[PDB]
Ligand binder design. Structure first.
Ligand code: THP
Ligand code: CA
Length: 129
């Protein structure tokens, strides 16, 4: 897997962000996670977590997995990094996201995220409380 350059266009919600990649705007869906919808519990906190994390980052990187970089709604599917910290793993670690949507061929960081979910669950953080 390789990290590639991108720049924040706009925060959207817990697990989607509008980025500019190779000079084009694109909405990205965070791989292997599921944040609550805004109007669900911890939804607003998930949005705020992700928003602050991307908005404060001096360096935004996009990391595709091995299969299909686009979803059926045309959203980019990627791992996103804010100054070298993975937003996908960061939400799960805080129990603001669940490991979810684990499709074979786009699952490189699955065990890494499940590790973070185990610890979040262990600490009864947010979603697990
Ligand atoms: C995370 C992810 C979601 N999706 C699709 C499956 C879901 O389809 P359905 O709409 O048919 O449920 C939807 C969930 O996204 P949201 O959690 O953003 O709603 O996005 C993928 O196809 N691949 C993925 O890696
Ligand atoms: Ca979601």
């Amino acid at each position: 897997l390789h990290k590639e350059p991108a720049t924040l266009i706009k925060a959207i919600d817990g697990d989607t962000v509008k980025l500019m990649y190779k000079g084009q705007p694109m909405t990205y869906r965070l791989l292997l996670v599921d944040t609550p919808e805004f109007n669900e519990k911890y939804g607003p906190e998930a949005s705020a977590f992700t928003k602050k994390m991307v908005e404060n980052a001096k360096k935004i990187e996009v990391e595709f997995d091995k299969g299909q970089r686009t979803d059926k709604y045309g959203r980019g599917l990627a791992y996103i990094y804010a100054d070298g910290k993975m937003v996908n793993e960061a939400l799960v670690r805080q129990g603001l996201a669940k490991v979810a949507y684990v499709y074979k061929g786009n699952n490189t960081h699955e065990q890494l995220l499940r590790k973070a979910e185990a610890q979040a669950k262990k600490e009864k953080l947010n979603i697990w409380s």
